[PDB]
Design a protein around this motif. Sequence first.
Motif, PDB file in Angstrom:
ATOM      1  N   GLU A 348       0.819  -1.214   0.000  1.00  0.00           N
ATOM      2  CA  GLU A 348       0.000   0.000   0.000  1.00  0.00           C
ATOM      3  C   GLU A 348       0.855   1.267   0.000  1.00  0.00           C
ATOM      4  N   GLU A 349       1.785   1.353   0.951  1.00  0.00           N
ATOM      5  CA  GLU A 349       2.678   2.509   1.088  1.00  0.00           C
ATOM      6  C   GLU A 349       3.629   2.666  -0.101  1.00  0.00           C
ATOM      7  N   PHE A 350       3.771   1.596  -0.883  1.00  0.00           N
ATOM      8  CA  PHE A 350       4.571   1.610  -2.104  1.00  0.00           C
ATOM      9  C   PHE A 350       3.862   2.388  -3.212  1.00  0.00           C
ATOM     10  N   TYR A 351       2.591   2.064  -3.444  1.00  0.00           N
ATOM     11  CA  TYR A 351       1.803   2.706  -4.496  1.00  0.00           C
ATOM     12  C   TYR A 351       1.232   4.062  -4.079  1.00  0.00           C
ATOM     13  N   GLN A 352       1.168   4.302  -2.770  1.00  0.00           N
ATOM     14  CA  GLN A 352       0.768   5.603  -2.233  1.00  0.00           C
ATOM     15  C   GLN A 352       1.838   6.658  -2.506  1.00  0.00           C
ATOM     16  N   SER A 353       3.101   6.250  -2.405  1.00  0.00           N
ATOM     17  CA  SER A 353       4.235   7.127  -2.691  1.00  0.00           C
ATOM     18  C   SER A 353       4.383   7.383  -4.191  1.00  0.00           C
ATOM     19  N   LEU A 354       3.963   6.409  -4.997  1.00  0.00           N
ATOM     20  CA  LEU A 354       3.974   6.541  -6.454  1.00  0.00           C
ATOM     21  C   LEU A 354       2.750   7.302  -6.967  1.00  0.00           C
ATOM     22  N   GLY A 355       1.792   7.548  -6.076  1.00  0.00           N
ATOM     23  CA  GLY A 355       0.586   8.305  -6.406  1.00  0.00           C
ATOM     24  C   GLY A 355      -0.394   7.539  -7.274  1.00  0.00           C
ATOM     25  N   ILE A 356      -0.602   6.267  -6.942  1.00  0.00           N
ATOM     26  CA  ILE A 356      -1.523   5.410  -7.684  1.00  0.00           C
ATOM     27  C   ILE A 356      -2.760   5.098  -6.835  1.00  0.00           C
ATOM     28  N   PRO A 357      -3.958   5.454  -7.340  1.00  0.00           N
ATOM     29  CA  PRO A 357      -5.215   5.133  -6.659  1.00  0.00           C
ATOM     30  C   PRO A 357      -5.548   3.643  -6.745  1.00  0.00           C
ATOM     31  N   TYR A 358      -6.160   3.108  -5.688  1.00  0.00           N
ATOM     32  CA  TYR A 358      -6.454   1.675  -5.592  1.00  0.00           C
ATOM     33  C   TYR A 358      -7.555   1.368  -4.576  1.00  0.00           C
ATOM     34  N   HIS A 359      -8.010   0.117  -4.570  1.00  0.00           N
ATOM     35  CA  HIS A 359      -8.819  -0.412  -3.471  1.00  0.00           C
ATOM     36  C   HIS A 359      -8.433  -1.821  -3.104  1.00  0.00           C
ATOM     37  N   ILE A 360      -8.484  -2.119  -1.808  1.00  0.00           N
ATOM     38  CA  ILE A 360      -8.144  -3.444  -1.286  1.00  0.00           C
ATOM     39  C   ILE A 360      -9.369  -4.359  -1.341  1.00  0.00           C
ATOM     40  N   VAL A 361      -9.178  -5.562  -1.879  1.00  0.00           N
ATOM     41  CA  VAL A 361     -10.268  -6.522  -2.066  1.00  0.00           C
ATOM     42  C   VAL A 361      -9.985  -7.849  -1.359  1.00  0.00           C
ATOM     43  N   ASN A 362     -10.978  -8.340  -0.620  1.00  0.00           N
ATOM     44  CA  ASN A 362     -10.932  -9.680  -0.046  1.00  0.00           C
ATOM     45  C   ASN A 362     -11.548 -10.672  -1.030  1.00  0.00           C
ATOM     46  N   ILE A 363     -10.711 -11.552  -1.573  1.00  0.00           N
ATOM     47  CA  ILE A 363     -11.123 -12.481  -2.629  1.00  0.00           C
ATOM     48  C   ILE A 363     -11.923 -13.651  -2.063  1.00  0.00           C
ATOM     49  N   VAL A 364     -12.985 -14.014  -2.779  1.00  0.00           N
ATOM     50  CA  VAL A 364     -13.846 -15.141  -2.419  1.00  0.00           C
ATOM     51  C   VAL A 364     -13.090 -16.471  -2.402  1.00  0.00           C
ATOM     52  N   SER A 365     -13.558 -17.391  -1.562  1.00  0.00           N
ATOM     53  CA  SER A 365     -12.912 -18.690  -1.355  1.00  0.00           C
ATOM     54  C   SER A 365     -12.854 -19.565  -2.609  1.00  0.00           C
TER      55      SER A 365
END
Lengths: 476, 476
Positions: A348-365
């Motif tokens: 997260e802190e990697f792409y935040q410093s690069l200025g890239i928007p994102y969302h975290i997803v919990n993948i289905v089983s």
Amino acid sequence: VLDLDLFRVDKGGDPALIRETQEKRFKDPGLVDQLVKADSEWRRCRFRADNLNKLKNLCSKTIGEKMKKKEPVGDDESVPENVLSFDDLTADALANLKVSQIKKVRLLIDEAILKCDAERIKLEAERFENLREIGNLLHPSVPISNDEDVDNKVERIWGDCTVRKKYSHVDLVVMVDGFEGEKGAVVAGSRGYFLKGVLVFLEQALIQYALRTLGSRGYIPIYTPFFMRKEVMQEVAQLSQFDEELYKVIGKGSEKSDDNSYDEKYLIATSEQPIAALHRDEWLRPEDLPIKYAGLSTCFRQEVGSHGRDTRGIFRVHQFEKIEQFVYSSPHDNKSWEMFEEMITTAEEFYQSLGIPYHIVNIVSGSLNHAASKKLDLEAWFPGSGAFRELVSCSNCTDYQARRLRIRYGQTKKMMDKVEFVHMLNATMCATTRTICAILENYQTEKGITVPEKLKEFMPPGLQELIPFVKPAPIE
Amino acid sequence: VLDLDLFRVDKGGDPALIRETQEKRFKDPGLVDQLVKADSEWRRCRFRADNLNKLKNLCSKTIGEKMKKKEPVGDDESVPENVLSFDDLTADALANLKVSQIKKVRLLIDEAILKCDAERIKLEAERFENLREIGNLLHPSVPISNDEDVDNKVERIWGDCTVRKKYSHVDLVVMVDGFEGEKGAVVAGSRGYFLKGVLVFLEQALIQYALRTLGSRGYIPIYTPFFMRKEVMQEVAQLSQFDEELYKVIGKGSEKSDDNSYDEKYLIATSEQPIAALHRDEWLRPEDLPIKYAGLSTCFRQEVGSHGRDTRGIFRVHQFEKIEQFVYSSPHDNKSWEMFEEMITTAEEFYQSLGIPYHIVNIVSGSLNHAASKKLDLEAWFPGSGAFRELVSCSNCTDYQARRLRIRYGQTKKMMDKVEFVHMLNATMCATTRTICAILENYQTEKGITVPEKLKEFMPPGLQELIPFVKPAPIE
Ligand SMILES: Nc1ncnc2c1ncn2[C@@H]1O[C@H](COS(=O)(=O)NC(=O)[C@@H](N)CO)[C@@H](O)[C@H]1O
Ligand SMILES: Nc1ncnc2c1ncn2[C@@H]1O[C@H](COS(=O)(=O)NC(=O)[C@@H](N)CO)[C@@H](O)[C@H]1O
Ligand SMILES: [Mg+2]
Ligand SMILES: [Mg+2]
Ligand SMILES: [Mg+2]
Ligand SMILES: [Mg+2]
């Protein structure tokens, strides 16, 4: 692979609980019933092997006693029928037979032990076929579904994910003149590419930045082999990965002109695979844990599952560089799950410093691999494409991979009944080809693509401020 | 591949001159005689194909004329024996036969043309088998010998090549903790390795420096595919390279679940191979030449030729990164040979700035590959080992590779009788694994390995001044 004592009712485990996890993963629960049946048949084979050993020793004992008393040995040498069974071959029955006859009986027992051992190996392989394709125990927070688009829970959202821009990554990769698709299609086949000039420096900037970001956090940078032996690759990959992901490599097996044999190898699809096999058959110290690796390798994927999917750009390709996080964690407490949240925030802190928007997803089983207990994906926003695209996958495999590769938690404080294996985790820091696509679409302007603040240091003089357009958009 | 008109006496070429070059390369001169014989047999096959076409047209002409006059066609339909030859099938003989009979004759001619074409393809493949294994025309300055140790002429010497140091590269690679051989031997097989920590940054420093050095000189940095298709790989590599160098890759050929076929690919041993195939079947402009490429790829070599050779260190391995110079040059004047001396000096000024002692060697004709006309090797001095070791190979392949890959010199000033192909050259700038070995041995001290002045910029903070020892020397 999972623990066998979970499948056994004689132990504390229960087969019905494993049947539930298979239904949660939306996979065949009948593999659990085939496991128990094969294990029960294997168990009976072991009892037969023990009885054959007892009868072999009884044959040797009767001869040994008759050699001391010196019997006339015998010239009969013919095997009697009325003694060739588990019930009939007794101490009294062997006493009536002569030395030359008992030696003939022992030879038939020796042939029976070899046949029993061949059955024992066959049953273990039959048991392993079922055991290989049974997934890991799921984390309570994992959504139980087969559908991804509907049931994938969004955890965190960072940056503006609504602002759309001018061009897609497909057009942007050609406009700056750093892509040769048609030439790569002739050379390597479909989906093959040549990355040239400006994007080579961009990739090298990402590699140099990702290694320094991890290296300062305690990670050990590691360059891995790009191919693995069949015996070892089977331990880190499932049968489906051999069908639709892994390339097969043919080598001589020996560096001699006289040799004519061939060894079958496999190209790696992740740095995860060779780093997982790094500490194969080892006893890791609790004081050394957690051991953190910053993997650097080229990944090879056959991508058979998807046809007509991202066929133009460098987003979905057979070949790409990737910097990987791999952590060996302690099985006790919540160490691995605390590391699981630590590794995703590192991404997260990697792409935040690069200025890239994102969302975290919990993948289905249903979409999880056999190794992973819980997976989190960082799907970055693509302004030109207008959709969220996968860049990062963070997985906690727990003691699944460690049991298969025999990587033990070598504690010296307690004497245990069962060996405890370490917890293993894998997460990608930066997938070069897909990260470039994210940078090009988010930093596009009228002149070209603006160099991100963090990458300005590693870019060559002349390309530190911005990467300008030199070619027009590939029009149809 | 060589020009066919050189083998033909009807043209300006002479087969005896090619026989001399084969003896100079210390290879079979009988392949030249097998070439001429196959070409003569192919020539006669073409004359037979022309006669069959003339007789096919004569059959169609006689029917066409009899359709206008409207003959009773005929109900015989039986093929006459006394007409089925080149001498017997004449205009007068076809006039006596009816329309239904001539149609039966044409069908047999059609079957004969297909048989003649199958013979024509077979003879061309038979001709190509000999043509493939005939080496390029040698430069006058190339020493003619089979022995390397005795007859390899030393051209230039730079730096102190007599001063010996403490440890060899084998011990140095372990002492700084950047090598895992035993672990790599299990993962990838013998000779497999894991490069870790400090040497990962050193490799990345070399890659970053080599690309910037070439990029500023007009070279175009290019990332290439690591595998190539069989059809294309055969055009850039000889039969011996398939036996003792190239790994075979097995893929599906199609990204579909229904597909069951397999496509055979090959892993690249050099960036030379894919970059050579980049401009395959193209007409290059004289104004664009010379086109210069700075290739960046991982190289895969089976290394079957050498067993028990440098088995401990990273000097001789199956897998290594390499930055490559590849130049497309004009065939006219001495442009390619001027570039040949330009490319070697580019490699010279590279290692001079890194402070590595070396000597330039002119390799004997017996050890040259089929493509190269002249090869120069930069053998660097290794103080710990006490011997000179190969780091760079610079080759001028002239129009050998261009003829095979159909890369033409597309001039627009003259109308020519024969197509002129471009001149292609290949030279390595930096072989990462072997360059590291050269740096470690030349910059070793009491504390560790001193970072070269040019590489100080690309090293991470903390490893900019020196790379210190952390482990003792691997003792026996
Ligand atoms: N065919 C492909 N072409 C280019 N990039 C890809 C391709 N497949 C996957 N990637 C990238 O590489 C990463 C690989 O992660 S993953 O396949 O999902 N899972 C893993 O392998 C985990 N071990 C994390 O690396 C992905 O996050 C994606 O960004
Ligand atoms: N098995 C190996 N392991 C490590 N490095 C190698 C190996 N084989 C060759 N190299 C290095 O890579 C370079 C390859 O050059 S070459 O094989 O001699 N010839 C070529 O391929 C030319 N196209 C120049 O690259 C060599 O100069 C050598 O320094
Ligand atoms: Mg995977
Ligand atoms: Mg996924
Ligand atoms: Mg070569
Ligand atoms: Mg050589």
